Amino acid sequence: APVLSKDVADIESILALNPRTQSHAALHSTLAKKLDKKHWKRNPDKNCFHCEKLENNFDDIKHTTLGERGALREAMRCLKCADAPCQKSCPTHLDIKSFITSISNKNYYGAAKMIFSDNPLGLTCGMVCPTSDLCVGGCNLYATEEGSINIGGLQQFASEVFKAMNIPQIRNPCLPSQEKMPEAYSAKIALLGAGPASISCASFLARLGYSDITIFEKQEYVGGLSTSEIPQFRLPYDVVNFEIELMKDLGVKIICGKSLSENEITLNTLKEEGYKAAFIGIGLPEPKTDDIFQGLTQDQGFYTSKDFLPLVAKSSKAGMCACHSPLPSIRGAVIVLGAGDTAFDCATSALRCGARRVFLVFRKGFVNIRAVPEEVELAKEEKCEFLPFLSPRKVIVKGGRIVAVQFVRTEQDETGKWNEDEDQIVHLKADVVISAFGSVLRDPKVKEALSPIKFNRWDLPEVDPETMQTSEPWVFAGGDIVGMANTTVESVNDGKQASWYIHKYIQAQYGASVSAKPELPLFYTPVDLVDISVEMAGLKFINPFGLASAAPTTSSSMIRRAFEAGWGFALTKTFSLDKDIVTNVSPRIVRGTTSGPMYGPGQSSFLNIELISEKTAAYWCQSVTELKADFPDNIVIASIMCSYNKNDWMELSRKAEASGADALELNLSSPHGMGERGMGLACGQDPELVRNICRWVRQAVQIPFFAKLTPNVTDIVSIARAAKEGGADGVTATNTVSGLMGLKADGTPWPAVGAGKRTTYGGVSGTAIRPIALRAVTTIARALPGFPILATGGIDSAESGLQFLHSGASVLQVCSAVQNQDFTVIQDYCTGLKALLYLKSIEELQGWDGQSPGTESHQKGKPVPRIAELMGKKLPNFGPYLEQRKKIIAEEKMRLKEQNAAFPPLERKPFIPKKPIPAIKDVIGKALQYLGTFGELSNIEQVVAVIDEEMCINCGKCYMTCNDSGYQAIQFDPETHLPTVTDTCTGCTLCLSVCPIIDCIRMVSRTTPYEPKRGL
Amino acid sequence: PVLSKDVADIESILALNPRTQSHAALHSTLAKKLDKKHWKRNPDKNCFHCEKLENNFDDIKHTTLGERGALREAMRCLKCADAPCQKSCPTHLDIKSFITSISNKNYYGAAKMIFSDNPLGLTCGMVCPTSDLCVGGCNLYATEEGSINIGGLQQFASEVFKAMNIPQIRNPCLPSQEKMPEAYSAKIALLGAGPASISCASFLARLGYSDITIFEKQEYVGGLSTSEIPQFRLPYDVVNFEIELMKDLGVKIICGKSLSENEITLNTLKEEGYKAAFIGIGLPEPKTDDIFQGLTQDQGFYTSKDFLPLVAKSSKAGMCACHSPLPSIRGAVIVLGAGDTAFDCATSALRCGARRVFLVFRKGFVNIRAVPEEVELAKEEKCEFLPFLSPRKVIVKGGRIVAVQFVRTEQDETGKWNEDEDQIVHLKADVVISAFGSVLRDPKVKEALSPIKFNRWDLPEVDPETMQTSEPWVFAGGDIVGMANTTVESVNDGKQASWYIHKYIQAQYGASVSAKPELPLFYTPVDLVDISVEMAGLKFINPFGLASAAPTTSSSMIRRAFEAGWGFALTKTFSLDKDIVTNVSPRIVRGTTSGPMYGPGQSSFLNIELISEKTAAYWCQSVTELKADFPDNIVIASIMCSYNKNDWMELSRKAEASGADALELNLSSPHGMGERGMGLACGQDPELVRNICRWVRQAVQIPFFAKLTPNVTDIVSIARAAKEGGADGVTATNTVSGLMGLKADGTPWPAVGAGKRTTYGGVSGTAIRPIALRAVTTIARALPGFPILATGGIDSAESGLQFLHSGASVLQVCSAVQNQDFTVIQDYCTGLKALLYLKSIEELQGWDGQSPGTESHQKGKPVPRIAELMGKKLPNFGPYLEQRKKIIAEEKMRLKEQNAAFPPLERKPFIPKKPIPAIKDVIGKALQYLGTFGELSNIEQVVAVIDEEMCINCGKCYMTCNDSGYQAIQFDPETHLPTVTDTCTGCTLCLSVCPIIDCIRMVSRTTPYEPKRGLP
């Protein structure tokens, strides 16, 4: 034999980069460290006066873009605030708490439903909202070092997944059918311009039931500025297409080529043609111009924003125009004038047209810039220059081209006046000049077509800023044309606002009234019709979710608000006879330590030393009667407890029955005996005690009752069997796990009661006991199949709840997930369950895990390029390897320019359920057939880990885990930090378990012969 | 009445509680604009007015962390192998290790590791231009949530250690001073008391040198860190802290003596017997221009070397004896340049009462040498940036500056910079500050460096690896050499030089050194705390060991674990030949017990791994070698047989003969029939455990411990059974039976073979700590003194101390290693020494271990305790934030005249005022607080109370009490400030969900308490 406890030489070399402890400080010269620094750099270099080449590169540059991994982390970080200030600062009043809650719970349909209910352009706004000036500007987490929440990127992700689902929008299912709709909803309605403002109005008017809505667009294309001028590298055009198709799912018609103009559409022709109401959303169609630039042409290199930006869009947004437009040749120095978000997008677009440098020249200072720093960041990092305090005076044209622009210095006084110093000039050499001063409405033929509505000092239509009504009651206006809004989201909200008051006007014109409280309908899809009801033990539940007997059911008044929120059923707090009344100590409910020092939302566990209800059985029985009177379709289960006393159990079970409880829950946490004949102290730990107690309750009541089991048993099957023999009609699995949540560093416990700082063993709830409760439910449902199981134990989403259903549970009680939140989580659970079952009917999404799409190769939540030279050549995303990636992409963006073909943006058509949408009964117990003994597991079918280096982020955790906890089977290249699984892999899967990039490591069938490591 | 319904007063308390919505909301765009300014938390892009910062030197760093923010960020760090952040740190700081220690709340271990490579670690963590250094190479850049705040984590851990008041000690590995070779008494001279010399002087003292002397020209120390770096980035008390640490090693500092020809010259040093010299005088003189000659401070002209010292002299208490005034800077201020210095002059100018600050540089924004950190502070303080401007003449009228005339610079075809004499800017200004850098121009200083070779930059030439000048005995480093730009690079230059200075001196005394540079680590009295412990007749050198699990798969892994410092180790469980097993794959999967958290810190793992696939021969030969090489490390052999007498005796004797210190009996073995619903495993029936313990106590003479299972009704029964059969102790506990979850389609994870089957696994990690903690406590109460080996979610010194306090002697670890690597042991051993050392410091009894008592903070920055801010209801948002900013600014003015800086504090280090406990002193001390529920006081009730200066207005306490409590909190609709009402019952749920550490506190109840009964 050799030395078994010493690594052989080639394993010694495997471990070369493995962490070892250190005995010394490490000598490294300040010089050497300077050159080694360049090998690992990830972020921009402060010594790079050089912008990498970006011509024809319209890839997503938004820093807010999120993948699933990133979006789940961020959603879990959000505090999900009451009266959340982020919503307060959202112009469309999105319930950001709710949709971010749905994202943490992996329910992206429910989040996207929340989003499009209040903003029909949620995916757009999620991408382009100046969140720092709006919702993120009010985020409570701004008061922490980690900072505010990326609200828009989360909203973009949840909306992106919903897009991929290809689910149509349906007509509001609360409405009557079209035939029995009152005549008023047949009113002919006209919208002018097909931008955000009108798309929002038409959608909200269709939601109300109006069945003849028409948007008249001037141009061959639709979407407004989101189509014509917002760059593709910030807003992909298929997003715009997607939100349009959603509105068209509601019957809104769009007619292009006809304009609001004299000798075209006028307010009068509309009135003559029978239109009962009109909304003006034509935007600001003309560019603000300077008399300095009179007579210049694009041939000389002059553009306005309204000239330049649509030219880049018509060429970089497939599906805009039948023309495969050529990108404009912009070779040289470019002067963009302006400081709104218009100018910054001509800046970044010029660099895409081949610009060699861009000067953003504005007439005021840096302090004075009108775009949000988000928009400014993308110009500054693409190395555009910034020239403040300069006003243009002459453009020098030589040889048919612009060759210079001469400015004068602008200045401020004491008065706050802005003058121009003639003596202080700047002759700035440039080849292209793009005025981006902004937009106006100046066309008389258009203003004339709006006769006789009133126009204000700014020659813009006056509107009641609360109803968006003009000086004619039947004509409304919103968005950029009003001069109030500066954003897509405020333009959307302007159409949202006008819709209800248009609905008010039209209904009044037909002799009908509307309610004094504006009620616009929510956003609906066929998912909302999925039947998530379930029957169990002879009781029908309207949804499988209910409140566990616990802190969220301390008072029955809280149960009423929960039923009012949508909860299917609820348990009373456990109550007993008067002689068994209790007093609680305090403190008695602490947060979990089970997942480290993470404070705030999503605690992984709680410990409680709380007893049963301090309130009386007289309170609970009268309460059960009141709640059953007002909520006949909401199951009310009274949880009860008595000593090991046949008279007591019989008397209390009879009283709770007479109160009208749909069922009973026998709390088996009551003691009897000393306690460890292998049977423990509590009744629920002894089979014979449980059999008798259930026998007694069976003799006493005629309603179904369930034994609530403790997990603190050697064999919970034996207890459940004992209840079934005793006559119970089901078991609730399980109560909390007996634990000690931890101690301070001085030895004292928490919770600590009184001056003595004493404690007792408490119960552990929450997701940290989910494997315990899931195991208990699985073994009961397999040992006693068909025996109804009410699952409790760390259920906090529709995805978790579905796992318990798959494991044999019929209904799902919740406690810790509400303590971590509030009662409204029920809405996320219900939409998440409707979504999960609906997706089971979609063939096209078979390659998904629930609401999660198949994780494609990505970096920073953006997909890595599928180029042949950029896959396989060992190129991690840092150091000199990243500069070569950026050169290969740039060259390949260039050969995709010198062949300007491929304009086939696929036509959107919805996915159709290919089998009946399963019911809750179609999934109960369907996972149990995969469970077995260990012998039923195949050791012939071994797997090995495989790593996707395009998704790897070079942390070497897999490397470390396999070395200090595995088989030393990963090589970690010392220059690229790229791991590679070798053939000594045993498939233990530990590396995958610790990889931070979702689906980077993958377990695949082993192809090379396997010999277990025996040592010998 | 109606009991299931809220009375009106409670209906009012619930006004802001969330409710599920049935309609989309109506809010006009105008109303949204007016409502947005009420919740705004961040700067408005519309406010151009600088906020008054006069005499405000409060911290303005965006990287400062408090404990709650630091703990989150250290947990988010992947703690990477071969970490690129460390390769980019000039001082090669082990970032992975010190951040791991922070994540485990071991702040001493982090600080010790930081100061081991960087004696100025607190300073560096505060001023580290991380984007161009360590954070520039961080892997988490490639994620959407971004690189790790390394400087903030360094600052926090270093700041906590600062507050501990623990001195640095001499290298304890050194011989006593008397027995030191005569060479170490060599007189060493260092010029300049800046970071370069402080580092070099510190590392020279660690090696053992006793006669070290720093010669500083001024009467202060610290170099630029004291003289020029502003107090709102680097406070002086930090510089004082680092100096006192160096002084702890005996380094001497003489102020007022200078390297100059009329004082200290190399000849005078050779004359006075000094045997080596280090030049760290930096660049003491400014880069001036001819444009400025004859311009005093009295005319409005400063250089950075003039202005910033006056401001530091005036804002850094204790830097000077002479109380100095804030320079009267009144009007427009031009700051010339764009280095790190220029932006400090701009920010310090606003502190002096500047009305307007213009930063003018001779190039563009793409050429700014300063870091994006630095630039942001001036940008967010409304400083104006003027590019492409070269100063040509200063206009002085009537004895003061009134304007500066500039010319427009531009880049040509070469890239060369030209001035355009024809394009001017007449910029009004009351003050000019040249920040063009620094030089060494003093000839008296240079002549004192004769005859060392100077280069074309007029700076000492040094071998960049040895820092040696042309004279062999003279070394140089820091800014004087010209390579360093940063404090950490100058620290590295001294670190570098100290080794080769060591070489030169030792050589000059006829002594050689190691060819491997080995600088000693940073040492405090904490490193001397004994953490050994004796148990069952065995001496453990520390209580931490590896559990029988994946980290002990091979003996070659146990060997590497011992080489890292692990006190003991269990072999993987091995068996006789006949019972050879074969694993399946996948078999180890990550836990879902804390939701979709990926990467570091998995709260649990689930495994279906069997015992070791390697033979008893391998493990027996391996134990022999391991114990022959590591006699002081305990090796316990884990063995398993079926329920069979001869087999248990054969295998236990074979492992004893191999030299095992002890045996661990794995009782996870199935027996025969099942019988009486009392588990299929041996460890679940106390009769079989007492028999197996009998049979092994038969075979062997060494101690043996029974590894107990937690999946039992009463673990104390199977523990007592072990103590009745043979056992010298018990290991509590093995893994918890569970199932970790299902994909949304029903298939499990792990999934074995094409059938996608699985079985019940074992749950490990921190999610079972409450179960393991409860088991160790019960066994310790029932069997006092019976040795317990603890297992179950030990992942830090703190968590291990909890198992020690609960009755355990040693601590087995598995999942924390799986989450990292073997070197966590060093974090554990440092943390345990710190936790025990601190128990002796009377000055820190108010701490929780290594966590200080939390004070009023926002973003981890002390709230100002001004009389006018408190008791007035001002949250940190909207108009309430401006009223606060107005209040601090009137107090920062009221503090300029109320002028006191003559009570500093002699930072005398804390001394142990009671013996440092040993492990034998803390075991079991938590058991006193444990007891039944009857032993808990229901008289000493508590109530919740909220510190509003700490609240971040999320409302979770409000929702948690509304939907999971007693509806006892008012949430004010205008301030979003909660207030706990008298109806509070002390349940403590609100404190448990609060994101802010210690914002809510449970206090004794003053008002009468009445249990809420609902009905009499």
Ligand code: SF4
């Ligand atoms: S560069 Fe400075 S802040 Fe960054 S890791 Fe090194 S010492 Fe710490």
Ligand code: SF4
């Ligand atoms: S949970 Fe904490 S931070 Fe949030 S409102 Fe309540 S007290 Fe304030």
